């Protein structure tokens with residue numbers, strides 16, 4: 001099973017998914033948990049079927065199923081967010097994506113962020129590189145924080161620290177889907193993106209993008225992230241990583257509550 | 259020699275289209291400078307787009323005057339027959355940092371009454387236009403009044419850096435979620451399309467909002483000052499563009515507790 005052969009299958013499934021999604025939206029149903037739609041659930045279930053059929057040994061860690069059965073020592077693992085940006089899907093029908101990442105004996109090998117509304121497939125392949133619709137991505141120019149746009153959820157952080165980030169950055173922007181805000185960092189459009197409480201599926205693809213494009217991707221302590229577990233995280237241009245972490249840890253830390 | 263709105267519209271949409279053929283080169287040789295201070299930018303792209311539009315007017319509409327960001331506008335008065343307001347690049351910060359999420363804004367006023375408006379999202383090749391008597395369109399798909407959105411059900415957009423944190427927080431608590439594209443024209447079009455409930459800019463110039471007046475009229479949006487008053491298109495004013503169903507609630511929040519400033 002070469003990486004290229006697997007990649008062929010995935011890109012092909014993603015392409016057929018264009019033909020399914022307009023119908024799911026047509027008949028869009030929404031519900032609460034404490035949002036999720038038929039689109040989230042169906043995309044996920046079809047991917048499960050795809051695996052059953054092409055890669056029966058492979059396991060799936062995904063948002064809309066239980067993941068109690070997933071362990072540290074698993075050979076072939078897919079982590080999926082079937083729709084990242086559900087709020088955007090529901091309210092805007094735009095600015096949402098599918099996230100897929102393949103880990104072989106725990107090492108990231110393939111990653112996908114499919115911006116379906118703009119028909120832009122970001123992909124990362126170990127040994128080949130990272131690509132947007134087959135235009136090859138390269139390491140972005142250095143961005144010092146003062147010269148860069150940052151993205152984060154300001155509703156979930158201490159107001160002192162939110163203000164410090166505003167003062168230290170060039171501007172603030174928010175797409176509102178972790179995958180897409182993270183790709184803005186990979187493309188050099190944003191300096192950094194922060195999500196203070198992500199699940200494994202919110203960040204799964206980003207590990208390989210960060211490695212191949214020389215981005216820093218760490219916890220808000222600067223540590224490695226366990227892809228099997230969440231952690232408060234940042235994906236950042238290498239030139240503004242330290243400054244952002246310094247700000248987040250200043251003033252008794254970034255958490256809104258102690 | 260007297261032209262219909264449709265004939266003017268043909269000329270403008272056509273000039274916008276040929277502008278696609280100029281811009282990739284301006285971006286290739288992009289240079290940037292400051293104007294007022296470190297966060298107040300302008301590029302060859304802003305200036306060139308503007309100047310070519312000035313030439314376009316000279317040559318097709320020689321009576322018509324231009325109010326635009328990158329020129330002095332001291333000579334523009336309240337009783338001007340044919341006026342264009344232009345923002346040659348709205349979203350300069352996005353142009354520079356992202357090469358995405360910026361637009362061109364054009365609006366034609368005849369004896370002070372809006373007749374034609376344009377928001378050209380050039381990176382996505384989406385031409386929003388509004389024509390009195392015909393309606394509003396995105397690439398010639400016709401736009402219609404959006405469904406009612408109460409604030410609690412709606413995404414809002416505003417610059418959180420320019421308001422006090424207390425009022426920012428109140429807006430976050432009262433809305434469904436918060437998003438920011440970062441170009442007035444595009445954030446406003448999200449309101450017109452029903453994607454956002456409201457967009458706020460607390461200190462816009464005439465070119466930041468010029469096209470939005472006609473869009474708001476034809477699509478039944480509320481577009482007012484943060485006091486709920488009519489805006490003078492010739493001058494700024496702190497402003498909101500909003501779905502009709504969340505307008506009052508947003509203004510109430512902005513004005514509460516001694517206000518949104520600071």
Ligand SMILES: NC(=O)c1ccc[n+]([C@@H]2O[C@H](COP(=O)([O-])OP(=O)(O)OC[C@H]3O[C@@H](n4cnc5c(N)ncnc54)[C@H](OP(=O)(O)O)[C@@H]3O)[C@@H](O)[C@H]2O)c1
Nearest residue numbers: 083084085086087153156176177178194195196197198435
């Ligand atoms: N810590 C953060 O930076 C953050 C960011 C967003 C949301 N949230 C929380 O989620 C709830 C609704 O979200 P919102 O409108 O603020 O964001 P949202 O716009 O609904 O979601 C934005 C991004 O955050 C992800 N997300 C959803 N719930 C999350 C959570 N509890 N923690 C971290 N990421 C999450 C989303 O993934 P899906 O689209 O796959 O849901 C999406 O990628 C709120 O209670 C909020 O506190 C936290």
Ligand SMILES: NC(=O)c1ccc[n+]([C@@H]2O[C@H](COP(=O)([O-])OP(=O)(O)OC[C@H]3O[C@@H](n4cnc5c(N)ncnc54)[C@H](OP(=O)(O)O)[C@@H]3O)[C@@H](O)[C@H]2O)c1
Nearest residue numbers: 166167168169170171347348349350351440441442461462
């Ligand atoms: N690190 C910092 O200290 C920092 C960072 C960001 C902002 N700020 C402060 O916040 C202000 C705005 O900067 P920004 O980068 O957030 O704006 P921005 O993202 O560059 O602009 C967003 C939208 O507002 C328009 N705009 C630009 N300047 C404006 C102004 N002074 N008032 C109202 N609308 C304006 C833009 O139009 P055009 O692109 O067409 O002009 C665009 O439509 C500045 O006065 C600055 O002092 C400070």
Ligand SMILES: [Ca+2]
Nearest residue numbers: 063081083084
């Ligand atoms: Ca999801």
Ligand SMILES: [Ca+2]
Nearest residue numbers: 081084085202
């Ligand atoms: Ca997610």
Ligand SMILES: [Ca+2]
Nearest residue numbers: 298299327350
């Ligand atoms: Ca400007």
Ligand SMILES: [Ca+2]
Nearest residue numbers: 327345347348
């Ligand atoms: Ca401008």
Ligand SMILES: [Ca+2]
Nearest residue numbers: 345348349466
């Ligand atoms: Ca502007």
